[PDB]
Description:
The record marks 4, 10, 13, 17, 19, 21 as: Binds Cav2.2/CACNA1B calcium channel. It is found in: Secreted. Belongs to the conotoxin O1 superfamily. This is Omega-conotoxin MVIIA. 12% of the residues are buried. This protein has 25 residues and is low in regular secondary structure. 0% of the residues lie in helices and 0% in strands. It has no helix or strand. The radius of gyration is 6 Å and the shape is globular. The termini are close together.
Amino acid sequence: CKGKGAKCSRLMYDCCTGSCRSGKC
């Protein structure tokens, strides 16, 4: 997954807790 402050994506809620903010977990 991705930690809160990771380069997430709008189409990828890769963060462990769906923390993704359209690109920032």
